[PDB]
Amino acid sequence: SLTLTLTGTGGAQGVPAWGCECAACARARRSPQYRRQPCSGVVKFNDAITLIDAGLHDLADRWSPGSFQQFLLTHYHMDHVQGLFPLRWGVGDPIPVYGPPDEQGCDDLFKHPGLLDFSHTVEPFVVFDLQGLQVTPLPLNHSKLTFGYLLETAHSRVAWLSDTAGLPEKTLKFLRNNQPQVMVMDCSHPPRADAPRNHCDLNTVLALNQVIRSPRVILTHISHQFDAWLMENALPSGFEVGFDGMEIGV
Amino acid sequence: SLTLTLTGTGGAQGVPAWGCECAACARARRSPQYRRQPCSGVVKFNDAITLIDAGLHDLADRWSPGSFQQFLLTHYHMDHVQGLFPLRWGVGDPIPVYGPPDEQGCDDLFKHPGLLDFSHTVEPFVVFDLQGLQVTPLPLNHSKLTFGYLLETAHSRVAWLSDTAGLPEKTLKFLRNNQPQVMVMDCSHPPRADAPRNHCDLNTVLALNQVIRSPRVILTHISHQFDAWLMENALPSGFEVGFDGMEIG
Ligand SMILES: [Mn+2]
Ligand SMILES: [Mn+2]
Ligand SMILES: [Mn+2]
Ligand SMILES: [Mn+2]
Ligand SMILES: [Zn+2]
Ligand SMILES: [Zn+2]
């Protein structure tokens, strides 16, 4: 059993954006299911649990020390690690934190890590094992050193690709050659005439999947402007928008 | 009219500390009214609202843009500013942020401030005015550049002093000479010998008030160990422990 739950599907600004009265933000206030907390996921493989990123601010209420096996981080932007701060001073055994070899980290996490063990840095395209789950780091195109991950068990493959703007060539080629059955993909922006710098727009994602050919692409890291667009425009077949609490099977 | 609310009365670790099952933490799990969120406050002077620090994670739910007048920051440790991150990308007019002239800030706040305006730096012992409220920055003893504040109206004087270990001489003397009727004070630890380095213990706060003689000292920034101690020991007359949500008029 490999499942993935999207615990947050937004960016740093979130939905609702603070004070915004656009159609998407008003909807999320009225109907909480449309709120989007910071982009993050929970992988359950057999008994083992991996927390992909740590942008939620209530992890300490969702989990106890030892109730999950490790963190897997994409990068050290605040919206992906701010949730580690209420955890580090906890009581319990060390908690492994797997992620890119970013030498600075975020604020004083590295200098004062508490129960978090950041020594578990990983390498592009070098597979590691999480309680049987095969994980491959994939370099992404972003303003910080950022890895996405291929997660594989028994030839079932899921790709976690946030945050990124149009994939590096080696990563694109690897994904084409290791076709994911499901790809969770940063698509912050509605379709644009130009590819944005740090996060994909819809047109970029469509272009990428013409090469990768994943049969199920789930868009995440959704901005309020993209939600507004989605309220009036349909996605093409094969693409769906993620939402907080979405459960993904294989 | 002047009201002060202690919206958070804990430190970075909080109460309950994650995974801790000591008497204080277990109590705070059974009864959330004993939880302590990061040290922060709200000052209301007539209609004007100042948010002191921004350690709470849900300011975006408590407030809308324009519903308060400014932030007043003591220092840029993460547990005092982490709540600004969910706000900066909002929709609204610029929000003044008053605070010490820390050149670095925290993470990328200064480079990418969004609606936050960090240009409102303040100076030790130089009074400034917030909608009629007279505010004096007071240097504190802490690992980052940190100011506490005297808040003064025609008849009332309240000091907000966190985070700090002891007080620098000029600040101590200023407080003795401008005796606060209420002093909200960092007291992270139960009575110790000696120090501590970055946050007061109870013996240090007692020593400071031997000089300042404020008639009402409210302890904040309380660690779980100090809470556990308080479950079994009384404080002297004139000292009380803050709680999240406590209102002071
Ligand atoms: Mn990022
Ligand atoms: Mn992001
Ligand atoms: Mn503090
Ligand atoms: Mn501090
Ligand atoms: Zn909006
Ligand atoms: Zn405890």
Curated annotation (Swiss-Prot), chain B:
Keywords assigned: Hydrolase, Manganese, Metal-binding, Zinc
Domain of life: Bacteria
Residues annotated to bind Mn(2+) 2: 79-80, 163, 221
UniProt catalytic activity: alpha-D-ribose 1,2-cyclic phosphate 5-phosphate + H2O = alpha-D-ribose 1,5-bisphosphate + H(+)
Top EC class for this record: hydrolase
Residues that bind Zn(2+): 20, 22, 25, 224
Cleavable signal peptide: none
Cofactor(s) named in the record: Mn(2+); Zn(2+)
Residues involved in Mn(2+) 1 binding: 75, 77, 142, 163
Gene Ontology terms: biological process: organic phosphonate catabolic process
Impact after mutating residue 221 to A: Has 9-fold lower activity
SUPFAM superfamilies per the UniProt record, alphabetical: Metallo-hydrolase/oxidoreductase (SSF56281)
EC number: 3.1.4.55
Cofactor: how bound: Binds 2 manganese ions per subunit. Binds 1 zinc ion per subunit.
Any Pfam family hit: Lactamase_B_2
Single GO term (MF): phosphoribosyl 1,2-cyclic phosphate phosphodiesterase activity
InterPro entries associated with the record: Metallo-B-lactamas (IPR001279), PhnP_MBL (IPR035682), Phosphonate_metab_PhnP (IPR017693), RibonucZ/Hydroxyglut_hydro (IPR036866)
Oligomeric and partner information: Homodimer.
Its job: Catalyzes the hydrolysis of the cyclic ribose-phosphate to form alpha-D-ribose 1,5-bisphosphate.
UniProt xrefs under NCBIfam families: PhnP
More info: The sequence shown is that of strains K12 and B.
Protein known as: Phosphoribosyl 1,2-cyclic phosphate phosphodiesterase
Organism of derivation: Escherichia coli (strain K12)
